[PDB]
Design a protein around this ligand. Structure first.
Ligand SMILES: CCCCCCCC/C=C\CCCCCCCC(=O)O[C@@H](COC(=O)CCCCCCCCCCCCCCC)COP(=O)([O-])OCC[N+](C)(C)C
Ligand SMILES: CCCCCCCC/C=C\CCCCCCCC(=O)O[C@@H](COC(=O)CCCCCCCCCCCCCCC)COP(=O)([O-])OCC[N+](C)(C)C
Ligand SMILES: CC(C)[C@@H](C)/C=C/[C@@H](C)[C@H]1CC[C@H]2C3=CC=C4C[C@@H](O)CC[C@]4(C)[C@H]3CC[C@]12C
Ligand SMILES: CC(C)[C@@H](C)/C=C/[C@@H](C)[C@H]1CC[C@H]2C3=CC=C4C[C@@H](O)CC[C@]4(C)[C@H]3CC[C@]12C
Ligand SMILES: CC(C)[C@@H](C)/C=C/[C@@H](C)[C@H]1CC[C@H]2C3=CC=C4C[C@@H](O)CC[C@]4(C)[C@H]3CC[C@]12C
Ligand SMILES: CC(C)[C@@H](C)/C=C/[C@@H](C)[C@H]1CC[C@H]2C3=CC=C4C[C@@H](O)CC[C@]4(C)[C@H]3CC[C@]12C
Lengths: 606, 606
């Protein structure tokens, strides 16, 4: 919380200003320090608002002379951490390491400061409130700051590299969480040494993620390249061609429930889809999509198209009988009604329709059985909210299967009004065939564009279009509230006025004009203003805004598709049986390389 | 095949690892090499998985000491090539030349390695599988790698420059197939020397292509400029103006069936149309198009317009009599029927129509006789698939002539239903006048744009538009399946519902609204959703996507037109008689320069 941290910092500065020892440590006033340390009544264990000692104040402002004088007067201040909530466990060693004062780190380790001291405070935890997540240990702080000398000095004094914070992250995870991504590779190389023998790269955090999986999730492409440099083998370099043998143990993740590629495509980070364009991963998912993914996706698309054709044919031949009542109202045009269940299935065509409806119900049950456990598997927000995983289509097909089952219930219980679920089910089921458009390059990015336009410019257009219809519907209704509805029936009731002016916004119906009668002049004025500001201005400004936001998000539209084709492969590999999806790569047991599976990439390095 | 090559490379590395001599040659372990070559039981002719010797392994990893020790123990390993399928014929000289080890090439030639050894393997042939096509000879390998010293050393030892691989390419063709295009000119200059006397530049491959024609086909513009540098003569350089005299022997290609420009404009390469913008070729095709091409294309366009006017006038005056049956059905509006052939031609106007129909049939026969042999001449895929040659228009006019002949057959055999071929023939014949739009700058690029939009954004729009119509047609049909069809007949049958909602997608008909009756509320909900997602969203998103893909392919649209005007000249020169197309250039026999035809270009070099 921002105001709490502002109060904490203000109170900390007030205690510093209201304590002569803390002010002398801050301003490096050595004379006042000698006077205060000469007096025995002055407490060496004075604590500030955050529980900081005077040594913490000396290390905070890089006053080496003040810190050495305080440690000469009281060495045990090196062993005293802070004890208040935003800075629980922070010692002077943490602040000395953060400020990169190597002589101060030497002086603190000389006095016996704890090299395993853990700063379990709210300011040192990973949070959107905190601006840096450098860990909880001085070794993690020195690794994330970027000082190799302090790292070597802490390791020589007994710092444990295999130390986990409150999130379970080791020093490698917090190194991969840094946004620098350049010196962190050098610090990763430094900390891979002294880990001589489970290695530190195989230690998962509390989310179960290895540093390889964490680099895949967080979208650290440079750290991913640095990690594969250690997981490759150059076979030959004859001429301009070289053949490298990447290891797919930590990429393919055979047997693991949450594989590497599944964590990559389901990650919320925008850089996380830039891991799919790297040298082993792109070749692996490209081999999987061409060899196995695309034919299986095409036959599933054909099966879903045939299923929707059967559902549509069952909707066309829906059992309707003549009405058993007279049409007294002259504005009532209903001549047919739904049959009861006893009379619905009598003829042979009704038996064929019964077979098709059983096929439809079985398909809806299959759709629900495929869709429901994945919501609990990957979370409700990530399943329905990510474009790469097919977010809106899962909501659409769950609504479609629910409406089909509701129509089955209404058919069995003889409820009237099956058109209301059936039209919704037809519209949602046929618009859910746009999922399979992600399997084709001609149709994938256009479908992603349609998704971006619907949740983007269409909603912000509709919010103002609603206030224009609500104005002009009321105006058009009250101008025609004193006129005969038979001559101009476009605005005769307020719902009809709303629908008529909504159609007049999009110019899908003609302007109401009866030239044999005398319309009000207020209709002419209001409709001229409506034609100016809605038809001419906003309906063309929507085209202009779509054209402006098409080229801005065009590059983002192609990348999101290339990822959508890595999530279709990573699902089909998960959901389809194993005999249809053979293990990808080259088996090392055939060639004596071991029990590992490799991928061979031959590239022209010139 | 990728998996076969992965298996081959893995098996090759496994044999290297399972053989002590091959592993010693790979790792350059000279002590183990001395131990193994001391033992007589160790076979010097050990072969790997690809049939490679230990000398091949030594040359593969640039181990010069290992290779010299192996050749000291066994010189005849220099004469032993590999004998397995991916690497048939590859010797150690090929791998030494590929890795640019000049001392190893000296040591191999000293031992008597074959300088004419031909590597007829699948890895050395031109293929999309292979990443490099460097030829099949060590001289071709040294030329394509870029080492002049190795080229001179191989030529001094007896390499044949006039050597052809399995594709018939000499060393110059494989030099022109390199994507470097900069050092290949220097290597071309080097290999033009030692060819002192048919020269090497006049040797065709198995496709009949010279290096000049191959550089034209492959779009190598830098090599084309380097080749004309040797085919030009500077007459004078007075001031800032210079007059050069280019040779049109290998550019115009008089008498040759497959000329240079015909191979250039029919090539599938995208860079191949960048040869038409070079200094002799652009001036030659510009002179041909202005002097002869444009008036002939204009009079052919006028003749085709008059022919289509005659065909349209014959379709308007089509012989129709009154029906000889009563209209019992109230929804039947047919009042006229086709006349029989005996009563069709009675009056004088019918004789004028007979003359016009004979003109139409003769024109269709002429169109077929012009179009049919060119399909067999240039291939079916290249004739119907290339925008530069007029791809879709040939399919359109073949369909048009076929429909005209089908209408003639139906007229002679008294078949009923000539409207079905005649409307198709009229639509296709009038849309085939867009071919002649390539003869004009105002109409050419716009027609290429229309072609790019139809095969581009229009198809990807129509594939999703089809799933929107199939959804909303079914919804609109089942909402009106219980209503009287007389009040709202837009959705009364499923084909009529499909056509009505297809018209409602493009807003070419009004929204169905009868204000004197009570329509279903489900129609209002479904039509509001349809108006949002089809009329507002997708119909404007098509405009936005066309505007986005107009400026991206605008530069490509002008270049494709400039080429289309070089293919119209190269066809008209081929198809029209020779007395209408005089030979282009300046005759050298008039001025004593020889039996060659030249083009004079005067340019301001400042
Ligand atoms: C969103 C787009 C649309 C949103 C909602 C669309 C439906 C509107 C409600 C219809 C109610 C109705 O039937 O009207 C009834 C009357 O009552 C009214 O006329 C109420 C008028 C409310 C106007 C604003 C609606 C809410 C907008 C909030 C959203 C703001 C969003 C801003 C961003 C009945 O009308 P009638 O049958 O004609 O009879 C009238 C009585 N008479 C016979 C005497 C004439
Ligand atoms: C492409 C765009 C369009 C494509 C095709 C356009 C023509 C559709 C077929 C028309 C068949 C027909 O006449 O309907 C018959 C019924 O049968 C049906 O209603 C069949 C419904 C099939 C729906 C999907 C069609 C194929 C789409 C596959 C492509 C997916 C592409 C995805 C990407 C007759 O209908 P009726 O005469 O009204 O009588 C019905 C019976 N009743 C009287 C009891 C009511
Ligand atoms: C007639 C009723 C059912 C109303 C509610 C209509 C709703 C349909 C037509 C709308 C609701 C949400 C829309 C929708 C949701 C999101 C996407 C994902 C996008 O990448 C392609 C279009 C697509 C698939 C569209 C298609 C049309 C849908 C499914
Ligand atoms: C402008 C945006 C917000 C889009 C969504 C507009 C929607 C509004 C204007 C549309 C959508 C559905 C329409 C609608 C639904 C159904 C009926 C029942 C019918 O018997 C009278 C009209 C009536 C009452 C209209 C009123 C106007 C509505 C509510
Ligand atoms: C009424 C029937 C005949 C249906 C099939 C209509 C087809 C016509 C209208 C369509 C089919 C393919 C279309 C077509 C093909 C390709 C091209 C090349 C392009 O550079 C200009 C437009 C042009 C020439 C268009 C014109 C319109 C055509 C010829
Ligand atoms: C959305 C894209 C795919 C474009 C091409 C749409 C085409 C469809 C919707 C159109 C094209 C031709 C139309 C068509 C052809 C002819 C007839 C016969 C007529 O008596 C009833 C309507 C009917 C059956 C309609 C149905 C809808 C069709 C098939």
């Amino acid at each position: 919380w921002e105001q709490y941290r502002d109060r904490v910092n203000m109170l900390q500065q007030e205690r510093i200003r209201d304590s002569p020892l803390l002010q002398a440590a801050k301003e490096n006033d050595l004379r006042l320090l000698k006077i205060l340390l000469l007096n025995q009544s002055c407490d060496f264990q004075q604590r500030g608002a955050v529980g900081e000692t005077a040594l913490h104040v000396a290390a905070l402002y890089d006053n080496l002379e003040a810190a050495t004088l305080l440690m000469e007067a009281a060495p045990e201040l090196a062993k005293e951490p802070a004890l208040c909530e935003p800075f629980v466990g922070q010692t002077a060693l943490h602040i000395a390491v953060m400020n990169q004062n190597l002589n101060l780190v030497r002086a603190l380790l000389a006095r016996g400061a704890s090299v395993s001291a853990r700063a379990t405070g709210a300011a040192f935890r990973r949070s959107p409130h905190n601006l840096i997540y450098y860990g909880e240990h001085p070794l993690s702080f020195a690794a994330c700051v970027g000082s190799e000398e302090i790292v070597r000095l802490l390791i020589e004094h007994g710092a444990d590299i295999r130390a986990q914070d409150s999130l379970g992250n080791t020093v490698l995870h917090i190194l991969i969480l840094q946004p620098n991504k350049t010196f962190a590779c050098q610090m990763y190389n430094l900390l891979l040494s002294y880990d001589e023998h489970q290695s530190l790269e195989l230690v998962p955090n509390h989310q179960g993620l290895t540093p390889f999986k964490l680099a895949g999730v967080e979208g650290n492409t440079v750290m991913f390249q640095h990690l594969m440099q250690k997981r490759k083998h150059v076979q030959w370099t004859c001429g301009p061609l070289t053949s490298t043998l990447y290891d797919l143990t930590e990429i393919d993740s055979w047997g693991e429930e949450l594989s590497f590629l599944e964590l990559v495509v389901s990650s919320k980070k925008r850089e996380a889809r830039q891991i799919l364009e790297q040298t082993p991963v792109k070749e692996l998912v490209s081999f999987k999509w061409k060899k196995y993914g695309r034919p299986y996706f095409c036959v599933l698309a054909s099966l879903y198209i045939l299923y929707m054709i059967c559902f549509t044919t069952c909707c066309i031949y829906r059992p309707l009988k003549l009405r058993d009542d007279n049409r007294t109202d002259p504005r009532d045009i209903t001549i047919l009604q739904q049959k009861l269940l006893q009379e619905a299935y009598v003829t042979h065509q009704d038996n064929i329709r019964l077979v098709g409806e059983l096929v439809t119900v079985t398909g809806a049950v299959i759709i629900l059985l495929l869709e429901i456990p994945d919501i609990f598997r990957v979370g409700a927000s990530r399943y329905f909210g990510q474009t790469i995983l097919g977010g809106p289509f899962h909501v659409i097909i769950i609504t479609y299967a629910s409406l089909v089952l509701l129509t089955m219930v209404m058919r069995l219980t003889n409820m009237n009004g099956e058109v209301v679920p059936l039209s919704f089910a037809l519209v949602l089921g046929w618009c859910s065939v746009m999922y399979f458009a992600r399997g084709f390059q001609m149709l994938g990015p256009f479908t992603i564009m349609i998704q971006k336009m619907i949740f983007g410019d269409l909603m912000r257009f509709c919010w103002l279009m609603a206030v224009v219809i609500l104005g002009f519907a009321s105006a058009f209704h009250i101008t025609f509230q004193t006129e005969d509805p038979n001559n101009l029936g476009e605005f005769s009731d307020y719902p009809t006025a709303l629908f008529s002016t909504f159609e007049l916004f999009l110019t899908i119906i003609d302007g109401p004009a009866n030239y044999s009668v005398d319309l009000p002049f207020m209709y002419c004025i209001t409709y001229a203003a409506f034609a100016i500001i809605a038809t001419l201005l906003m309906l063309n400004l929507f085209i202009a805004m779509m054209g402006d936001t098409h080229w801005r998000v065009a590059q983002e539209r192609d990348e999101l598709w290339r990822a959508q084709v890595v999530a279709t492969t990573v699902m089909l590999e998960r959901k389809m049986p194993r005999f249809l999806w053979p293990r990808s790569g080259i088996c090392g047991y055939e060639y004596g390389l071991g029990d590992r599976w490799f991928l061979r990439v031959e590239n022209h390095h010139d």
